[PDB]
Symmetry: C2
Subunit: 263 residues, 2 copies
Amino acid sequence: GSLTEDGLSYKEKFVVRSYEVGSNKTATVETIANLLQEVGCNHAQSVGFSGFATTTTMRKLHLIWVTARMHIEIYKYPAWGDVVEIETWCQSEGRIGTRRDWILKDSVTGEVTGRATSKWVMMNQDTRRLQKVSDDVRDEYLVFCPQEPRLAFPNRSLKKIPKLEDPAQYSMIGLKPRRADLDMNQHVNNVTYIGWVLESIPQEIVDTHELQVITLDYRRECQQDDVVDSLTTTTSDSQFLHLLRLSGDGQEINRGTTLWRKK
Amino acid sequence: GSLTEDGLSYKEKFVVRSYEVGSNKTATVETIANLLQEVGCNHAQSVGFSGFATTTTMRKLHLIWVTARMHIEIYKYPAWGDVVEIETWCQSEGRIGTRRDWILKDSVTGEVTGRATSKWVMMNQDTRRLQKVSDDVRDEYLVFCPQEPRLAFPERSLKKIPKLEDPAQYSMIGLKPRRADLDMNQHVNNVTYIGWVLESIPQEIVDTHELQVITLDYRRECQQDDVVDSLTTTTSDSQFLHLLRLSGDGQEINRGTTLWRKK
């Protein structure tokens, strides 16, 4: 992949692999999310970011970016062997945090097949205390980001998500991460949570519908030795409300919604 | 990737991705095994194989190949961003079954960084009854395979593995597959079992040693709604003996050995 001409966005092509596809022989939403993260990492590397994707001031102040929200809309999942092109870029959102956006295209047709957006907040790596973005970090972002707004979603991606009320309609309990679920820093990979959310969807919905939209808020991390319960209730196209919580004390780790279209 | 000049082997290049690496920023053994399976699938496609990698006679008789044994030796794990080249080929082993072999090379240096071999047996897809290879299937293999022997392991990969005796030294219990662990035909992916075996290795071994060799026998499949326990005992470099069994009735799924070298 490489930076675009203006140096303000990044593009990369991927061939969908055999083990990356589900029962209709197209990429799973987890494969898609992994690809989004890979192209994000390649972008950060190309513009001079560090394990973590920090800036110089951030390293000085022991700060990291963490994900607050991920929103993905897929119009067409690429088939096994197909080539997908992904374009990504970032923007600062003042003192609130930053945003990374993606567009997915079929590289044969050049048609948009999906779009995604994510919100990131600043966190002290040791205390794990959330903070506002300092003036000096905003200045570093400015040089690698478009100055005028550029939005993948010009709005479902901004909607408030409510907390599922007991009892849930469906559940999958006793979920735990294995080593393949961890990143190089031994944190649970953000895409694992997407998989866990989807585990409490009935196989029948999955057999008969395609996922069109997922929105996931990230409230707290699952540790390597934690155990998670995944809860879902129908709110309807079918729509669902989702909650991930620690199996023991019921501490919330994520909430989300999904929207599914009949095939 | 493509077939080599003679049409009797297949080569493919892969760039190691951000989410494919573990704590020392090199590819996990599970990433390696996934890449082995991907290049195997690309080879099969290129020589006219069909979901399943069946031949024409196999489909006619409702037969499939299943894995009986996987053996991997790694000398050097490729780093994040490195390019690895993998060469693969198959051979018939008379009426016993077939073999697929792989060689892994650094594409910058051309050095061999790893080797693998796998044994496959014929199975009736409906009855799940194992069978010998028929004369007409041997005939189909012969046109795509080298005629003279070509072994990734000329002269450990053939050693008999004993059954771990209770009590195990170490254990990880209540493992279950999620949708990301299933292949396009909804069977548990062969690489999942590797991950499950490794889960009962202590984190300290993993922190201080590199996995050099893994040998895994495949006795029976884990179904999508099964639960697995992973058992390990030190037999020693450190060596371990491994058993995967169904959590309930204790039915054996897999047995194996690993060999580890201090860093």
